[PDB]
Symmetry: C4
Subunit: 463 residues, 4 copies
Amino acid sequence: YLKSVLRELVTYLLFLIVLCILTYGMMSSNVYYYTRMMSQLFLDTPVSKTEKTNFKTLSSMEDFWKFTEGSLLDGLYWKMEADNRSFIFYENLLLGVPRIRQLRVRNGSCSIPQDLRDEIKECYDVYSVSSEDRAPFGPRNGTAWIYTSEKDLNGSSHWGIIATYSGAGYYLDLSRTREETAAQVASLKKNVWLDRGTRATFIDFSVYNANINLFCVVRLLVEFPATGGVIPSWQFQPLKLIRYVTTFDFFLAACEIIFCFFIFYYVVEEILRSFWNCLDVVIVVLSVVAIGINIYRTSNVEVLLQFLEDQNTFPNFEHLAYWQIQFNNIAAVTVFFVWIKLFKFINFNRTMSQLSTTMSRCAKDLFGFAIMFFIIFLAYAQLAYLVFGTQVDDFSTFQECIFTQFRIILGDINFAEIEEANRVLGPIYFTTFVFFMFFILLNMFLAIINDTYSEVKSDLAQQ
Amino acid sequence: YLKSVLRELVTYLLFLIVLCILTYGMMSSNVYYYTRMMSQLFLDTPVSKTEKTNFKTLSSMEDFWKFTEGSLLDGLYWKMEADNRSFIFYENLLLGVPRIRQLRVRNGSCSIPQDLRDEIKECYDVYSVSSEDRAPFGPRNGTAWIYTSEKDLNGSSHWGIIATYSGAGYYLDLSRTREETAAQVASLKKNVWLDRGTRATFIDFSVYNANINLFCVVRLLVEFPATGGVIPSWQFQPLKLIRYVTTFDFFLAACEIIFCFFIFYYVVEEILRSFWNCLDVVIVVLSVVAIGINIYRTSNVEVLLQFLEDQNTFPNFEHLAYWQIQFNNIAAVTVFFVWIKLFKFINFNRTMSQLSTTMSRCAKDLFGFAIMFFIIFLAYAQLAYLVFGTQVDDFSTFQECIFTQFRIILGDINFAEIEEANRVLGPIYFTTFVFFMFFILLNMFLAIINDTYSEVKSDLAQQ
Amino acid sequence: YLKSVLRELVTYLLFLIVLCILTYGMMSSNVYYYTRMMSQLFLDTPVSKTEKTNFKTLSSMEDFWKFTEGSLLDGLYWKMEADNRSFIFYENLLLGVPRIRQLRVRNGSCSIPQDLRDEIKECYDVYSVSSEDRAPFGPRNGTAWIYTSEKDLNGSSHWGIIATYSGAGYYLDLSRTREETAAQVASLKKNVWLDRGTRATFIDFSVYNANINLFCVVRLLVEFPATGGVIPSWQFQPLKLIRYVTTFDFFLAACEIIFCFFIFYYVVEEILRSFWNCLDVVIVVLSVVAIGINIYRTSNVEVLLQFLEDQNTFPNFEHLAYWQIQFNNIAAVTVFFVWIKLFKFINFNRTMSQLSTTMSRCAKDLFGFAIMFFIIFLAYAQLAYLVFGTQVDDFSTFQECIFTQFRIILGDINFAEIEEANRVLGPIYFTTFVFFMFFILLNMFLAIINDTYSEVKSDLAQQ
Amino acid sequence: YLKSVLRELVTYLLFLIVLCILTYGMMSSNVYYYTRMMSQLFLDTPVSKTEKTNFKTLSSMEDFWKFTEGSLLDGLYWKMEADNRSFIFYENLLLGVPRIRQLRVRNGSCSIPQDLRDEIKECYDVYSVSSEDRAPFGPRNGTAWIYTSEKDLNGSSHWGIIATYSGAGYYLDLSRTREETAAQVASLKKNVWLDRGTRATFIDFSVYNANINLFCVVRLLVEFPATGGVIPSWQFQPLKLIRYVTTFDFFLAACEIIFCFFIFYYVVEEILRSFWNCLDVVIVVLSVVAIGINIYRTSNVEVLLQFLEDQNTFPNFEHLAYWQIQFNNIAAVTVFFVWIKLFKFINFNRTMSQLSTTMSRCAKDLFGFAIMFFIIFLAYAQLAYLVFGTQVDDFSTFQECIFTQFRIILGDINFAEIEEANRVLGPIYFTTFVFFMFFILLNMFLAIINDTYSEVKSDLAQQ
Ligand SMILES: *[C@@H]1O[C@H](CO)[C@@H](O)[C@H](O)[C@H]1NC(C)=O
Ligand SMILES: *[C@@H]1O[C@H](CO)[C@@H](O)[C@H](O)[C@H]1NC(C)=O
Ligand SMILES: *[C@@H]1O[C@H](CO)[C@@H](O)[C@H](O)[C@H]1NC(C)=O
Ligand SMILES: *[C@@H]1O[C@H](CO)[C@@H](O)[C@H](O)[C@H]1NC(C)=O
Ligand SMILES: *[C@@H]1O[C@H](CO)[C@@H](O)[C@H](O)[C@H]1NC(C)=O
Ligand SMILES: *[C@@H]1O[C@H](CO)[C@@H](O)[C@H](O)[C@H]1NC(C)=O
Ligand SMILES: *[C@@H]1O[C@H](CO)[C@@H](O)[C@H](O)[C@H]1NC(C)=O
Ligand SMILES: *[C@@H]1O[C@H](CO)[C@@H](O)[C@H](O)[C@H]1NC(C)=O
Ligand SMILES: *[C@@H]1O[C@H](CO)[C@@H](O)[C@H](O)[C@H]1NC(C)=O
Ligand SMILES: *[C@@H]1O[C@H](CO)[C@@H](O)[C@H](O)[C@H]1NC(C)=O
Ligand SMILES: *[C@@H]1O[C@H](CO)[C@@H](O)[C@H](O)[C@H]1NC(C)=O
Ligand SMILES: *[C@@H]1O[C@H](CO)[C@@H](O)[C@H](O)[C@H]1NC(C)=O
């Protein structure tokens, strides 16, 4: 019997090191510095030589135009040998052409109160699919001034910080050289292409590095709330599109075939309470979804093929970059659970079995109290969100009030801005929360664990 | 019997989701960014193009005048279509006219020691109602140079950081356009309108956004301590004055009528130790006070009606903004306690009843020790306030010494400035406090909880 | 018997509120802002309009001269009505005249290794009383270039960050007006008054505010390590020299007489193990030392009397400012222990007596373990000081390694600079320390407390 | 018997204070400020008067050349008396001559995917020993353009942040005076000496201070990842090369002879489970390795002798600086364990023996759980490294994911950049980690300790 348990064990071990290789394989080492250099080049540099603002700092439309005609262009273009081709840092192709796209809301989307109608002529509602503006505003001379559908314009919905944004909109494709684009952008500034109705503008381009082999897909997102102002956000996503270059790449591709066999085998075994059963299900479920993504989605690479035909176009990678994120996310979570499955095999020792039986017994009591706990925890969260949240960034949304309260328990705090927001409840909230939660309530978990642990040591000693 | 308990339960649940809607309803989602853009526009921008100071940074009267003639004016005025009307960010009316007001203390308010009378001619005491200056200083040509009572000048006492300030004072109303105000402020600077005797100056104006429907009331407060210098502070308060625009607004107004019924019903039930009784009282008390505020106070909106008649005046919203703060505060605290009332219904399960009976028993022991605890805790607070508090900001006041000690327990610390203040007690205070409080004393709570918990598990197991 | 215990109790209570008044009385409320404005005026302002350095930032002698001829002069002088008198912020007399003093080390104080004697001509040792330079360097035209003894130059030893400094040295007194001093300082710069041999320079002046009644004594200390460079440090100390102005000042002076009676009475009672006895001794000891300081030291005020005779001199307050620090320190520590003496009276309740008997029993076990603990704790401290401490500021000295380890336990950390210092032990130190100390060892206290607590609840229940 | 235990005790005590002296002796007090001034002079100063970047901030090759021709030269040269000799801060010889060295990778080191070969002409692989470029690029006019082997160029492999770097490379030695070097560096800039193929450049020089007697060896390392950009790093290492100057130096040298005797004696005693035996072994092992380093390695000082002959050369100290690091590291770790050996002697008291027997019993249970713990801990680490690590600095490498998770437990967090990286898993990771690890799992240690402690108090009381 112990042999059969060890029989399935060695099976499991290989499944680890197979999976251990893919992750280490599918992720190059220093990639962090590849994004870091991109980000610092765009995000972190002064919008203009005389200006102190970053891209992260943009407060206004005026700042935005200074960015486009500013550090952005000077970030995208380098000379340097085509010379129509520009190597960022000299190591990185700007791949194809950048694209700017905006989203726009209709005039009468909202309604002015009858009292002020004599005062205010027109309003523009918060962005929504219903309120979107499809009208051909402006000179109507091209794709910049004419709406194009999300189908006709290949693209997908992007999820921003205040809203989700459709792929459709008013877009313009830039040019290969700095001189040509600077003309276009100037024209988009001369004519007013950012108006009261613009909610969001996207700037997307892709970069290819040949030293290591990686694409980098960039999305610079700028939102224009109905309240005025600017909310910048960005995404820098590396990709591995060309999977066969080095022999080591072929080495990995072998495993992805081998790794496919195991899952097929675990599906076989899984055919037929318990916790460890619920574990195996979760692994197999995610393991399939990972492969499903890896094949009929991320292995298509139809875009690259089209792009390499004509290199003057916009290389739309937004989807490919999207799925590999979803892939990496899922792949990681599998790996995590796969490690936890190892505890099933640690019961060899007395002391280990001594512990496992305790935590198994810990569960029913703790879970019962966690409910009691989070009801109180979420009460504060909802309280903090009503008192703060029009003031403090950390409390801005109900999601982030929850996260902030974890940071408080750990000691990450900005107390000053809490007290500035409300000089009465700010202190009361903080004090009472820190008191009841951190002093009394956290200790109530640890009370449960001691009892249930010492109890299990009591009776097992009786045996 | 269990049906009756469940009978009152479903009653309670509806009362939640009713109340859950109002809060979510009465608070728009992204409002945070509406204040954030206002604040960054005024607080966060350099006082002048050549100057590095914010409004938050003001160190002197000279800096203050640079702010008024500086970023303030350039923040309030935009061109842009009336053109007498100015849209901040282009989305936000500057509503009516700004108003500047100062407070002033009499000459002989204080007394010079007889030894130095030959040296120093005149002193000016710390601001107080007694020492306030009602004399018509200066050219005496208008409301700027003539005192006006808090009654005659509609307004209320504001509570600042070093003092409470009456609504009365010397005020001047600005103009609609940047050119006219810049003349006025220049005249207030030419003639000396900020002198030895000025303790505080207020800058108040209101802003209306039509996209979302919200007013924003702004108070820029600047204090001039008797010690010289400047202490800036600010308040940005959104308001919802016009309550019927969208159908969803009508949807909410229905609930506020429905919600009024429940409280009337709970008042009926409450007519006749125990803890849960003390809970219901607290809810009903606050729930009434909330409605009282909501009706005969915040539902008056007499000011708006007067303002819309003549739009060249100062739209005094200070009160309306005040009460909605008090309203939101009270509303939040009710919601908080309403959630806690849910524990009364969690006793269905064994394990829950297992826990409830423990924490009920935890109380008498913990409270007994908390007294023992805070006596020690407050001892340090008073110690730290005497040693520090002339040096370190965090210890500046006895209130904030208490808060600082919570931040220390959690790990939020600036130790450097503590050691700079006193190089001997600074370390001794910090060491001993962290030692006795965090090591020994916190653990004394958790000692109590373990005992009382394991005891309750002992005897209930006997049954 | 319970009456006698209550008889001594009410005696004790009055002693609190008497002492509670003096502290609140002897410390004005907003004084923090009085120093804060002084500090920001001097410390925090750019050394020159074109320079970005503060006084806190000084890296070099060149920076120092830029400070003296820079923000310092522009900080000390204001116009403004004598006009020979200058009111800082317009509220604050510059009192008398500033004074600059330096300390200097002899040439041959150190010894050059025989190998390099052909290379290096001369060395200057670290500052010490033995190596001090009394020679009249330079043009020898005045007190700036001639040594004056600590006796002949009224003054005391000051304790700096790298060394203790005698009051003696080479000093120069500045002038009343900005124009005259700027000439002097220029001459001290033209002629080289800061040379290889200068270890430290002091800048001392006093400021009087008449609105509130307080002096402010300032010491700007700049050290010049033997390694080259600059280490700035500062002290801003308020004082209350004139004790009778307001009636409330007379009100306090009454208590200081009353408060003297109590201590005389407690000395009577104390004439004749136990812990509470050891408490009363400590209070009475400190309470005497406080009064001793308060009378024959701080109540002398002979300097002020001399100063007010001739106001063109340097008002040496360094001692008076020193003692009131020592006074405030001692006064605070008494107050702290006085509160703790209150626990002697909390034994009325069962639960309180229930707790007191536990912590009394906790002592012998905890203290035994604390020894075991700090041996390990200090081991790391000594380890961290050897590995780091040539690199990381926080570990610079063995004293501060101890403090840093407390900050680590609480979560205040700069990990980056630890890893930069040593990329191997840095992580190992941090990991192992956080592991053994925070996981295992802290929990060993709490293990002791639970046992000894639950034990005391066990047997007392048997009674 | 107790005498013999005390007999070995006093032996041990002397061994402490002997060792206590050496450490305090071998480490001068204020050395921290000696490096701090060096670092701030080079690292912390603006690359140019018009530029805001430090050396720490370098983002590009262009920035690098601005640094060399910039603050570096102005940092190395001072006038000041030879005058060919330059005293940094006037206290510090620039010793000999600086040296710049770069490392270079071959053209075809990597391979371009066949699809893009028409596009991209050439690639340069990540630095490795295999891909290193030994070809004489450029004008081939000197050691700057010609490869020199690590043997022929005295030097050792340096371990950088992304790679290990051989001592070999293309180097150039600068000149004694600022004017001459500025010509050389200009020529290295005119001709392109930093190209696509440069992975890393080193700048090494040594500084001698005669006031205190210390050398300071400096390494300024700049890496050029294959992804483009710059990654600066630095090392400032003090040294004591000349060991006999002061009598106190002779005093220490006596102990190093005495200290050699003890280890010889403990080797004698150690000749022949238990834990304390395993302790003594570790001490003796390290104690030997320390002396081995101290004699046939660090006591050679052959370089200094050669250097003092001809002072126009490059004084290569890289090795000497290296070993004293290794020496200080080992010396510290010995001292640490030596303190812990003191617990062997604390068993005199009951309470101490009461504790020792507990922690001895704590071990087997805790260690069993630590395994269970770190499996979970490392699971998160591997998870966080896959999700983050292309984004967040703190997660950049798997090593640092581990360290980051310790900082999270303590409360050191940057949550913002976690949420920006991944807006879904970022919160989930952080929440679940903080929940399971900090709430449940940490408390599982403390559960073990309570049980095993109270158990030992149970049975010992029975005796
Ligand atoms: C928006 O609609 C209102 C409603 O009539 C109209 O008065 C205004 O001119 C419109 N503005 C634009 C830019 O279409
Ligand atoms: C549309 O008309 C404007 C007005 O002159 C012109 O500047 C612009 O170039 C035109 N658009 C295109 C695509 O030619
Ligand atoms: C979408 O993809 C199709 C596929 O060839 C292409 O023809 C079309 O131009 C794309 N749409 C764009 C680039 O807007
Ligand atoms: C303030 O009062 C004193 C008291 O006589 C007087 O000398 C001084 O001129 C007064 N100053 C002002 C501005 O009124
Ligand atoms: C008061 O007199 C001054 C002095 O000329 C003048 O500048 C100011 O305008 C006058 N005030 C008013 C309200 O006209
Ligand atoms: C106060 O309110 C009354 C009400 O109409 C108004 O007449 C008066 O002008 C207000 N006071 C001001 C604006 O100072
Ligand atoms: C310091 O002493 C040395 C020893 O002779 C001498 O050569 C040097 O000139 C002296 N320098 C000064 C400034 O006194
Ligand atoms: C000492 O001599 C120098 C040299 O001219 C002179 O500038 C300085 O003023 C003299 N000192 C005094 C106190 O006059
Ligand atoms: C020290 O105090 C005495 C007392 O009058 C005074 O005469 C002397 O000038 C003082 N020394 C100074 C100011 O250096
Ligand atoms: C690098 O190698 C490729 C391969 O042929 C060649 O085309 C290119 O010119 C080479 N570049 C340099 C700088 O040697
Ligand atoms: C190599 O040739 C270049 C080209 O003129 C010249 O500038 C450089 O000085 C030469 N190298 C040496 C070491 O002379
Ligand atoms: C290495 O050391 C030898 C020993 O004398 C020396 O001759 C040679 O020049 C050194 N190599 C250098 C400095 O590159």
